[PDB]
């Protein structure tokens, strides 16, 4: 089975792991900081997802250094993962256009 498709898959399992860990680490880092709202697992998960997809509505965000550090990792993972899929879709289109022409 083609590499680009393996990577895409990996990227997804990975992203999910990061989202989950991201949620846990965020709450762990944010609790103890007065005024912090990223302090319960369920919403933290919703937070990381909206962060990984880079949407970030602003209803939730870390205020501590480690929380933000966890945010960066999640942002980057989401961006890389989704970009890696786009890349897989390209290799797919490129590889098949070569077919519709012969090679």
């Amino acid at each position: 089975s083609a590499l680009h498709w393996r990577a895409a898959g990996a990227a997804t399992v990975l992203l999910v792991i990061v989202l989950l860990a991201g949620s846990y680490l965020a709450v762990l880092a944010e609790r103890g900081a007065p005024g912090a709202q990223l302090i319960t697992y369920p919403r933290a998960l919703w937070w990381s997802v909206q962060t990984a997809t880079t949407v970030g509505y602003g209803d939730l965000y870390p205020v501590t250094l480690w929380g933000r550090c966890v945010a960066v990792v999640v942002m980057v993972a989401g961006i890389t993962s989704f970009g890696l899929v786009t890349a897989a879709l390209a290799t797919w289109f490129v590889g098949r256009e070569q077919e519709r022409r012969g090679h």
Epitope: L28, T40, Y41
Partner: antibody
Framework: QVQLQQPGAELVKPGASVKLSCKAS????????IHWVKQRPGHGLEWIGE????????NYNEKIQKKATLTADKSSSTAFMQLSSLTSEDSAVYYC???????????WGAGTTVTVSS | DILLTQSPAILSVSPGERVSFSCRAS??????IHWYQQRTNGSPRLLIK???ESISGIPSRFSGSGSGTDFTLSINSVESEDIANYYC?????????FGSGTKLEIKR
């Protein structure tokens, strides 16, 4: 079955320091936080601090004098609170509760009555 | 830190009547409010979580409502077993905080 067990009482001499216990049983998750609440006779509930066993970190209430030190023993499923140099002011009922990381205290221990006298 | 105001402090009501305790947050906390009951010498007992969600084992008699800064815990048809102290607690922002408490008192 009784999820949080705490010693009925503890006598402490002014200046001394007792270490309260709270052992849990039932479903225990990696997202669990054990809290400690202090209730002076006749008054209300005062949040003291929290700890996440699966990781060992603890946070405390800043509005008050920190007289507690939270710890947790993974294997025995027991959370501990070290109150030091107590005084009459520290005498009260100390409860421990379990919070599933979703913000509310599902279950509380029966609480430990702590009396600080000579 | 978020302040939870519970007034009146004491509530007097006749048996079977409907009753409501109020809890006001110093700032908007969504529905991250929870209610606890504590009878004479017992430990707190979770009544309502997240402002309106019910807990199992709690008389269908107890309901919650509110959002933002104003929350209400109602008891449709009060009865002797309801005589206790009621507290509210928020998990919107760290640290969790508690209300001053409201004592339910029945007039028989």
């Amino acid at each position: 079955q009784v999820q949080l067990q705490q010693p009925g009482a503890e006598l402490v001499k002014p200046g001394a320091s007792v270490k309260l216990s709270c052992k849990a049983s039932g479903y225990t998750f990696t997202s669990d936080w054990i809290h400690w609440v202090k209730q002076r006779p006749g008054h209300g509930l005062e949040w003291i601090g929290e700890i996440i066993p699966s990781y060992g970190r603890a946070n405390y209430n800043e509005k008050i004098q920190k007289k507690a030190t939270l710890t947790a023993d993974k294997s025995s499923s027991t959370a501990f609170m070290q109150l030091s140099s107590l005084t009459s002011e520290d005498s009260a009922v100390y409860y421990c509760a379990r919070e599933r990381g979703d913000g509310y205290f599902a279950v509380w221990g029966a609480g430990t009555t702590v009396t600080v006298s000579s | 830190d978020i302040l939870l105001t519970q007034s009146p402090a004491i509530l007097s009501v006749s048996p079977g009547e409907r009753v409501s305790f109020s809890c006001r947050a110093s700032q908007s906390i969504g529905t991250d409010i929870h209610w606890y009951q504590q009878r004479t010498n017992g430990s707190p007992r979770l009544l309502i979580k997240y402002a309106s969600e019910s807990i199992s084992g709690i008389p269908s008699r107890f309901s919650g409502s509110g959002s933002g800064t104003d929350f209400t815990l109602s008891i449709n048809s009060v009865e002797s077993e309801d005589i206790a102290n009621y507290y509210c607690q928020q998990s919107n922002r760290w640290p969790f905080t508690f209300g001053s408490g409201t004592k339910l008192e029945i007039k028989r």
